[PDB]
């Protein structure tokens, strides 16, 4: 039984008064509300919003039985007696409290019929997590398939079909019951911690999520390197075995950006080693040398590290003296039995330990490492006794990767000032993508059913802030012989996900360098694929860097007022343009790729498909996956290269797909230094921009430029323009008012400014793009 007593306004915030003790209710943004219970006592901080100190000026009106607290979109109405916060945006009713707060901790809502609820970051049970119940508290799921309520990276956080985010801001032990136990209730539960919830409304799904990463953080843009080829296997076990796997890459001409060094760098057992942080030299007997070597041939070196300094490691002694390490309640440092060993955990929360942890990152980063890969940040395990700085093991558990993520963001930005971070985690926290964390699924299992998992733990997780989600790709776990079929479909895929990152235990090769001539022969041309489309996939990674926009989509997005399609984890978008369904069986001979009404092509075909509805059959092959391309599209491309130190778009080409049902179409491609961290922030970018309008007797596009450039900037690009279904009725052609002819014969045979192929429906238009806006019409 509770009831409203009085209430202030204070900074813009308001405090309520019950019998039961004081609300804090501040407006983080206009479309944002931080709900702080018990806001008189003593608390963790919050985790989840980027500016915690932000309150804007909202509205306050007062009516007998109500209280109104409005920003913009967003307005809290709270009922007095019984006392019960509910949300509005207009006056479309978002999220009820039932009973609200009570005692533990415990947050009870109203769920509407016929709700669809997303959320509760990496699980494997359907994308609609309604009637489902489970636990937030980050741990391992080594081998998991098809099935999982519990892995790495969860998230307090669910999205609705009402287009709310609702986040529960509370790093501890909890759960989450959303309408299981009782169909029509949202249950939020902890041990301790943080007795606050955040709601964030929008009018689409897209600009939900802008005004989510608007108050949770805003991924900063990774450097370009990190959308290349990785080189990764568990685990390189010498430097002549990384040397040799950096020149099988460049033997059997796949890119190369990146090799990941695992924990033998360190030693050359799987335990007992874990804390020395430092180069096993019997194995590396010349690392700097080996790293610099690598950098001459444009490949960065990323290594691992954890958590974790085992009692027999180096570095023991001196972490103890320092007091680096989380204590038992006695005070001494505590240590515990892990797989690898018994050890201690260093305390990111402190100021010890971030300072002891900080200096070791500094000084192999000063030796050559370009970036960092942090394993078991769940923490893998976290003893309930364990007392960190502020708090015990069980209060503060989903919050120690997000902090690790933050103090070694930190130092990097400040040993490299010039620099973007590379940071790659498996454990984190709402909002630890402002820190730039990159997140993948862990030690999947090498089969099909690990393979069809992906799309829904990728869409799950961008959906809720993490853009760079991806897969070990040809799987992690277990097997004893390659599995052909599934490592090709993996590696596929791989091309239209975030990273692309193979990686598996080293009994069965991950680099599809180590492949067989066929498994080669496929995989080459798509790796550089990849390459080409760099692009496309960093301009999407630019618009998330803006607005939250996820890389890969889900296809809900396609039409948000039907519902069902949010139970769709088969089909998704890899940015605007291109509707990918993976592979995730042996010997499918077609698939039915339920594409949004409109008109698409075959990327690999051409062909031309018109959908009212009906999905469209396609059949499977096994050199590609099918990818269809929305009509409208601007598909920009760059020659191939090795590395992405050698990138440039002194030539673009770029793929235009005409269809009169789309009379105006846009497309964009970002271009900036690919590493400068504040290229964004001070316009030190060149944004090319394309307009397409399509009528009955016209085809113009309008090109520009704009943003104040950066070093290196091509003055004039080459461009080569393919419209794709183009009319065979086009007679001429002006480039700024200049009228050439359109050739229609010996398209792919003469150095042609405009020509017509009629036998593939495409015209070639070559011309030079500088500065200067230039217009292109074609006319009948
Ligand atoms: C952590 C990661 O999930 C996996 O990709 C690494 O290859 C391994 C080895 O460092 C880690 O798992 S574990 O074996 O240490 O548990
Ligand atoms: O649609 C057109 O413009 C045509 O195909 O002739």
């Given at each position: 039984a509770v009831f409203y007593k009085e209430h202030k306004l204070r900074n813009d915030g308001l405090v309520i008064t019950t019998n039961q003790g004081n609300i804090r209710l501040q407006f983080k943004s206009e479309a944002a509300i931080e709900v702080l219970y018990r806001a008189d006592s003593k608390q963790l901080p919050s985790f989840a919003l980027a500016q915690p100190e932000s309150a804007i000026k909202a509205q306050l009106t007062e009516t007998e039985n109500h209280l109104q607290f409005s920003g913009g979109t967003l307005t809290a109405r709270i009922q007095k007696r019984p006392f019960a916060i509910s949300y509005y945006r207009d006056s479309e009713l978002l999220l009820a409290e039932e009973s609200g707060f009570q005692v533990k901790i415990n947050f009870r809502?109203?769920?509407?019929?016929?709700?669809?609820?997303?959320?509760?970051?990496?699980?494997?049970?359907?994308?609609?997590?309604?009637?489902?119940?489970?636990?937030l508290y980050n741990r391992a799921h080594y081998g998991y398939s098809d099935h999982s309520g519990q892995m790495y990276f969860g998230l307090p956080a669910i999205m609705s079909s009402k287009q709310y985010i609702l986040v529960f801001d509370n790093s501890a032990s909890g759960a989450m019951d959303i309408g299981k136990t009782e169909s029509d209730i949202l249950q939020l539960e902890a041990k301790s911690g943080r007795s606050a919830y955040i709601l964030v409304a929008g009018n689409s799904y897209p600009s939900l999520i802008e005004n989510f990463t608007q108050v949770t953080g805003r991924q900063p843009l990774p450097p370009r390197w990190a959308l290349g080829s990785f080189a990764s296997r568990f685990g390189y076990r010498s430097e002549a075995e990384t040397r040799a796997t950096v020149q099988k890459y460049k033997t059997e001409d796949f890119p190369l950006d990146t090799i990941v060094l695992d924990l033998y760098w360190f030693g050359k057992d799987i335990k007992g080693h874990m804390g020395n942080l430092d180069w096993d030299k019997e194995n590396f007997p010349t690392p700097l040398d080996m790293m610099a070597d690598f950098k001459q041939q444009g490949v960065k070196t990323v290594l691992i590290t954890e958590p974790f300094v085992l009692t027999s490691s180096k570095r023991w002694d001196d972490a103890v003296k320092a007091k680096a390490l989380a204590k038992d309640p006695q005070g001494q440092p505590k240590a515990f039995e892990l797989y690898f060993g018994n050890g201690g955990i260093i305390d990111v929360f402190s100021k010890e330990g971030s300072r002891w942890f900080s200096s070791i990152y500094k000084d192999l980063?000063?030796?050559?490492?370009?970036?960092?890969?942090?394993?078991?940040?769940?923490?893998?395990?976290?003893?309930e006794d364990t007392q960190h700085?502020?708090?015990?093991?069980?209060?503060?558990?989903?919050?120690?990767?997000?902090?690790?993520?933050?103090?070694?963001?930190?130092?990097?930005?400040?040993?490299?000032?010039?620099?973007?971070?590379?940071?790659?985690?498996?454990?984190?926290?709402?909002?630890?993508?402002?820190?730039?964390?990159?997140?993948?699924?862990?030690?999947?299992?090498?089969?099909?059913?690990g393979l069809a998992s992906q799309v829904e733990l990728a869409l799950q997780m961008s959906l809720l802030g993490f853009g760079y989600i991806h897969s070990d790709l040809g799987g992690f776990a277990d097997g004893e012989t390659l599995d052909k079929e599934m490592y090709i479909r993996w590696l596929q895929y791989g091309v239209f996900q975030p990273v692309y990152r193979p990686h598996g235990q080293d009994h069965i090769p991950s680099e599809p360098v180590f492949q067989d001539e066929e498994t080669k022969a496929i995989l080459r041309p798509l790796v550089k694929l990849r390459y080409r489309m760099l692009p496309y996939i960093y301009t999407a990674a630019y618009q998330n860097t803006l607005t939250g926009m996820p890389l890969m989509r889900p296809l809900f997005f396609s039409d948000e007022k039907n519902p069902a399609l949010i139970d769709n984890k088969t089909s998704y978008f890899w940015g605007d343009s291109l509707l990918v369904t993976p592979i995730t069986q042996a010997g499918v001979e077609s698939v039915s790729i339920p594409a949004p009404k409109g008109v698409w092509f075959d990327f690999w075909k051409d062909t031309r498909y018109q959908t009212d509805g009906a999905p469209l059959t396609l059949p499977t092959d096994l050199h590609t996956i099918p990818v269809l391309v929305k009509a409208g599209a601007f598909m920009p491309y760059v020659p191939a290269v090795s590395t992405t130190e050698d990138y440039?778009?002194?030539?673009?080409?770029?793929?235009?797909?005409?269809?009169?049902?789309?009379?105006?179409?846009?497309?964009e491609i970002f271009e900036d230094d690919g590493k400068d961290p504040n290229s964004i922030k001070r316009n030190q970018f060149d944004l090319l921009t394309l307009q397409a309008t399509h009528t009955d007797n016209q085809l113009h596009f309008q090109l520009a430029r704009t943003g104040k450039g950066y070093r290196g900037m091509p003055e004039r690009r080459a461009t080569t323009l393919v419209i794709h279904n183009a009319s065979d009725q086009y007679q001429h052609l002006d480039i700024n008012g200049k009228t050439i002819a359109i050739a229609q014969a010996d398209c792919a045979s003469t150095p042609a400014l405009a020509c017509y192929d009629q036998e593939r429906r495409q015209l070639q238009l070559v011309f030079t793009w500088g500065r200067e806006a230039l217009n292109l019409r074609l006319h009948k």
């Open positions: 809502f109203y769920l509407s019929p016929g709700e669809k609820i997303l959320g509760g970051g990496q699980r494997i049970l359907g994308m609609d997590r309604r009637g489902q119940r489970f636990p980063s000063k030796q050559g490492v370009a970036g960092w890969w942090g394993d078991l940040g769940e923490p893998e395990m976290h003893p700085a502020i708090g015990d093991a069980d209060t503060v558990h989903n919050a120690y990767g997000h902090r690790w993520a933050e103090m070694l963001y930190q130092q990097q930005l400040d040993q490299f000032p010039e620099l973007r971070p590379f940071i790659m985690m498996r454990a984190g926290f709402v909002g630890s993508q402002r820190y730039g964390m990159i997140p993948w699924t862990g030690d999947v299992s090498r089969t099909w059913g440039r778009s002194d030539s673009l080409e770029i793929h235009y797909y005409a269809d009169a049902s789309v009379p105006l179409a846009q497309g």
